[PDB]
Amino acid sequence: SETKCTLKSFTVEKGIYQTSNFRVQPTESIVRFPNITNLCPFGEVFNAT
Amino acid sequence: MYICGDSTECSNLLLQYGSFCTQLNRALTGIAVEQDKNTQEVFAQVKQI
Numbered sequence: 001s002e003t004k005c006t007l008k009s010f011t012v013e014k015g016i017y018q019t020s021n022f023r024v025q026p027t028e029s030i031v032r033f034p035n036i037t038n039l040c041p042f043g044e045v046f047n048a049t
Numbered sequence: 050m051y052i053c054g055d056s057t058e059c060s061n062l063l064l065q066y067g068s069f070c071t072q073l074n075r076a077l078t079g080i081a082v083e084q085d086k087n088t089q090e091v092f093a094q095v096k097q098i
């Protein structure tokens with residue numbers, strides 16, 4: 001059926017055809033960053049007079 | 050895959066264009082079949098071994 005879709009026809013003649021791909025989907029997601037705990041000093045630029 | 054690497058938000062934009070990807074796939078498949086035919090035609094002149 002995928003071959004029928006990519007060939008845009010209801011009848012497929014004898015042969016070998018290429019249909020789409022086999023891209024492997026990721027299982028899950030990871031995020032890694034340095035463990036910096038101190039908040040940035042935005043009070044010395046915003047909360048300033 | 051070459052133009053919009055595994056990104057649906059890019060494949061959707063590509064789909065707004067024409068059938069360029071299908072045309073390129075057709076051309077490259079024709080090239081490969083032509084090379085195979087050339088190799089077959091040059092060497093397989095006589096069929097008896």
Ligand SMILES: *[C@@H]1O[C@H](CO)[C@@H](O[C@@H]2O[C@H](CO)[C@@H](O)[C@H](O)[C@H]2NC(C)=O)[C@H](O)[C@H]1NC(C)=O
Nearest residue numbers: 037038039040041042043044045046047048049
């Ligand atoms: C110092 O900066 C902080 C962070 O922006 C301000 O605290 C917040 O201010 C907003 C806007 O008035 C309030 O809605 C929040 O409730 C405040 N608290 C928190 C925990 O976000 C604070 O107002 C600033 N101080 C001065 C004098 O400008």
